A = this chain, B = another copy of it.
Amino acid sequence: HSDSIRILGENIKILDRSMKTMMETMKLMMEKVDLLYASTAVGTSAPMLPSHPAPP
């Protein structure tokens, strides 16, 4: 049953294309709030407190 494998393989290809779409939609939506994370740090006494770290 090669065709049954190939149809769902094309489905995984479409899913991979939508995954590359999602990888970039999220990276658009970084930018507009990233410059807002920037834009209001006027610095009276610097009350910043990052909470969750990141893996290497």
Contacts and interface: CB of A to CB of B under 8 A. Distances in A.
Interface residues of A, number: 46
A33 to B, nearest CB: 5
A56 to B, nearest CB: 11
27 contacts: A1-B1, A1-B5, A2-B4, A4-B6, A4-B9, A5-B8, A7-B9, A8-B8, A11-B13, A11-B16, A15-B15, A18-B23, A24-B55, A25-B30, A28-B30, A29-B29, A29-B30, A29-B33, A29-B34, A30-B32, A32-B33, A32-B36, A33-B36, A35-B37, A35-B50, A36-B40, A39-B41
Interface of A: 1-2, 4-9, 11-16, 18-41, 47-52, 54-55
